[PDB]
């Protein structure tokens, strides 16, 4: 498409500044590091105890 | 008469994992893993990729008669081949050092 | 709670408090409410901010990496190349996931710990002038008011200024 | 002991106790004995179980990897291949060993910490009704019995129900 | 301070004390001074020594690694080789830096923690015979002297031997 990115993959373009991505090992541009993960969520807050 | 010390809490449904326990719900959290995309092949620094379509590198460079649409291409951000890139060497033969050549083309 | 405060001697969260991560509850005759602690909260904010940024800096962003082609007499080196690709992919996947597991435990600990610090910093201010009434609560041996409530959260509560009053109160038990 | 309990203010282990990792000792006139704490022990059990499994999941099991042959004009690429083999082997050896070092410290900490939590959770129940007699021991200001011993380990000991008795006892000091 | 002692309830360092990392301050009428704690300090010394050595052992020293040459029809394999060189270099750079970040936090924690242990180990010795006068200080309910100061740092202070004296002193408040 007539479309702009800093990071392209065979599946399509990524527009993100996260450190990791699980879309594709093949990358062109500045991309996040491919990894096999399905979930990478880092706690910042504390345990949410509503009751 | 009283005072108490306590900690925040909210309607979040973010879960994380920890050494000691799975699926812990937390008040705040960042996601490190990017998993969405465009769906599309885009320009990089404003330059379009070269779409070889039904040709492959051989067809393009040699000028396979099926690749006339490419005759005009002269600059690109990256080269795309497709599952249908079969028009290359129309007269049968080896293309010696074809992979080196492709690696050369890469820069 | 490795530090026994969160999910511990202080059982619950305060969906009421929305100022910040750590805070006090108070009920003076004048009324009730919540007031989050600046100093601690801003610290935790700052630190955890640094933690996320520090982890992310350690990740150089990935630059162009496209695969390599090989012809059918190059199976060994095509396999060498896959071994490298797979080898690095295992390592980064392991690093990413393992880090996040381990560091999530540390973060939660941190929060638990800050809370305990807060409590104990108050406790060392009050002593006699109030009693440990459970779940992170003090009960004043003397009467105190909203402006006085601000002396506590101030870290400047004047223990002498009410020690007299509290003495003859406590001694009636 | 980073948390000062184990190998600390509570000097020793109880080869007597065999119910679990954490437990109380009691001697009421009726007799002596050991009773391990369910809630804590089962927690520690559960957690440490999760910890071992989580670490092991991060290890994908190794699949067929047989070495490659090379002829005598292929020394560079045979050396490239050894470099990769040795390079990954260093990394996995370092990861394995380093993890186990670091995580062993965390685990022991965990246990120390659980124990301190236990002690302090009791201490916040008893207060006046007993005194800190050293090495994780309380001494009752009032007389108490086996069924009463179960109120402690219950986390439900009724502080008021003996506060009267203990008061006039303590006040004889 | 994750353990609330350092940069916490004990605000400052003692450029006076130069014996060791942890120590007491005392002022008996006979005079003032500093005396560092052997047992703790030597422990911390020993441990942190082990920590540095353990980390460094995990690093096998690097042996001869000189780069490889390639001719102009070998661009793929020259690129494979650079990928390996760069790949391992990223991993070691990440490991080195990340470890040092994380372990620096643990080390500082350790020191904070040792200090808290010390304080509390004293506190459990004194109780009534002295009061919590803030910032890691006790105030004796009885008079005590230099040789007596050595009973404290001894971990053998005789609580009964001054309990009498301190009782009638404290009770004048
Ligand atoms: C990625 O896409 C998002 C929008 O989907 C863009 O985010 C924007 O950030 C810019 C610049 O800081 C803002 O001016 C926009 O208003 C943001 N958009 C929205 C909807 O809030 C971002 O610009 C995109 N980047 C690229 C390279 O495509
Ligand atoms: C994570 O925690 C959430 C919320 O406590 C759980 O959500 C449940 O998921 C189950 C099983 O798929 C659903 O059928 C329930 O209706 C959900 N319950 C609630 C209270 O939201 C979930 O079980 C947890 N996820 C995992 C993978 O354990
Ligand atoms: C969470 O909080 C926001 C406001 O902070 C609210 O508008 C939103 O609907 C809430 N979600 C739930 C599930 O309560």
Swiss-Prot record, chain A:
Superkingdom of the source species: Viruses
Instruction: Please report any disulfide bonds recorded for this protein chain, giving both cysteine positions.
Output: 7-31
Glycosylation positions in this chain: 15
Q: What is this protein called?
A: Hemagglutinin HA1 chain
Q: Which organism is it from?
A: Influenza A virus (strain A/Brevig Mission/1/1918 H1N1)
Q: Parent protein range shown?
A: 290 to 340 of 566
């Amino acid at each position: 498409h007539d479309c702009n990115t800093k990071c392209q993959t065979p599946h399509g373009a990524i527009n993100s500044s996260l450190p990791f991505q699980n879309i594709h090992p093949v990358t062109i541009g500045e991309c996040p590091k491919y990894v096999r993960s399905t979930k990478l969520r880092m706690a910042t807050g504390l345990r949410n105890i509503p009751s | 008469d009283t005072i108490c010390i306590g900690y925040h809490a909210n309607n979040s449904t973010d879960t994380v994992d920890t050494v000691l326990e799975k699926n812990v719900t937390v008040t705040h959290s960042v996601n490190l893993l990017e998993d969405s995309h465009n769906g599309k092949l885009c320009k990089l620094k404003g330059i379009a990729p070269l779409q070889l379509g039904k040709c492959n590198i051989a067809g393009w460079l040699l000028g396979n008669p099926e690749c006339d649409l490419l005759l005009t291409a002269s600059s690109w951000s990256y080269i795309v081949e497709t599952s249908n890139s079969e028009n290359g060497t129309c007269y049968p033969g080896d293309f010696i050092d074809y992979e080196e050549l492709r690696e050369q083309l890469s820069s | 709670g490795l530090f026994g405060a969160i999910a511990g001697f202080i059982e619950g969260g305060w969906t009421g408090m929305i100022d910040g991560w750590y805070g006090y509850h108070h009920q003076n005759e004048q009324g009730s409410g919540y007031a989050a602690d600046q100093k601690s909260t801003q610290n935790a904010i700052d630190g955890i901010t640094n933690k996320v940024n520090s982890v992310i800096e350690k990740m150089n962003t990935q630059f162009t990496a496209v695969g390599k082609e090989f012809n059918n007499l190059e199976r060994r080196i095509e396999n060498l190349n896959k071994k490298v690709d797979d080898g690095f992919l295992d390592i980064w996947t392991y690093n990413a996931e393992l880090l996040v597991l381990l560091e999530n435990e540390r973060t939660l600990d941190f929060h638990d710990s800050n809370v305990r610090n807060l409590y104990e910093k108050v406790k060392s201010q009050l002593k006699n002038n109030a009693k440990e009434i459970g779940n992170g609560c003090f009960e004043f041996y003397h009467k105190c008011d909203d402006a006085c409530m601000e002396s506590v959260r101030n870290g400047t509560y004047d223990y002498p200024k009410y020690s007299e009053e509290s003495k003859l109160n406590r001694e009636e038990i």
